[PDB]
Amino acid sequence: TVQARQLLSGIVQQQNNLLRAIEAQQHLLQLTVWGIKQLQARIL
Amino acid sequence: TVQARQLLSGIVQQQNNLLRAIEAQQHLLQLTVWGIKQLQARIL
């Protein structure tokens, strides 16, 4: 039904939301991995 | 279809589960960001 397809569209949009969120988190996490390695190299 | 109602409920719940997990990981990443900033200030 139109109603069911509205929900399915919402679910697919939500998955795109979550995917984009984790992609952006991966970019930030790459920057933090680099930062801690740079600081560890300076000390240890 | 109504046969898929239980699957659909579980799909929506699984999105809740994944959202909550990503939110929690985001807050831990924010902590990691500031931990590296303070370490950089102290080291450099």
Binding site: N17, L31 | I22
Partner: peptide
């Protein structure tokens, strides 16, 4: 990146409430 992530999570949170409401309404 932090602002990009926060905006996506905020949108995801609203979509989750909407999806849960629409599911209940079926």
């Amino acid at each position: 990146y932090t602002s990009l992530i926060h905006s996506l999570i905020e949108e995801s949170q609203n979509q989750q409430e909407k999806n849960e409401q629409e599911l209940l309404e079926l």
